């Protein structure tokens, strides 16, 4: 019912209704800038979300790859999870690439960021899927290579089972000497809970972030659609953490 050919109009209609209050949008922008994070319930309609979730589950079944690694560029923090890479989503999907190209979605995110939110210059980071499903699974402390990440909560357990997001904004990623523990000591951590159906926006290049490990065998699945800034387009970027976690 929802397809690459009609999803753009649905995204624009929802944004026009959901974010009609200019003062609410101003507050969302200020929260995003202050905290590096803002929750955006209803960013897409429930129907669009469900269509995107259905595609996500299909991609996981065909393509998911188990990883159990630790990355020196983020202080040897763990990535214990299963993943689907951008190449497989671009090859097999249709809805997810169409949402990623959404003029209306990028235009609303530009309002929050107060600058142009645009396509990522490295194709392989535009969108990925992670599935946490075993006790101990986690997306450990890290930064993103690009500026504007929207996380889609495709599945999530009750928060006492793990999966809470934690953030420290206004930091920076030095891959040669990331100093994760020094940042935790210098600044407070904000923790945010999410349920299935939620969406949130994250300033991934300057917000140090992670998910709290699962403490039971439960399923948490996110889609990560990652957009970029003007400055992101010309900065020299290495992709080692991306190459390590996704096919
Ligand atoms: N740099 C991230 C890779 C995933 C980013 C997704 N856009 C990390 O270290 O986990």
Automatic annotation (TrEMBL):
Chain positions recorded as succinate binding sites: 142, 200, 220, 224
Q: Which Pfam families has this protein been placed in?
A: HalD (PF23169)
SUPFAM superfamilies from the entry?
Clavaminate synthase-like (SSF51197)
Family annotation (Gene3D superfamilies): q2cbj1_9rhob like domain
Q: Which InterPro entries match?
A: BesD/HalB-like
**Superkingdom field:** Bacteria
Q: What is this protein called?
A: ArpA protein
Recorded source organism is Streptomyces wuyuanensis
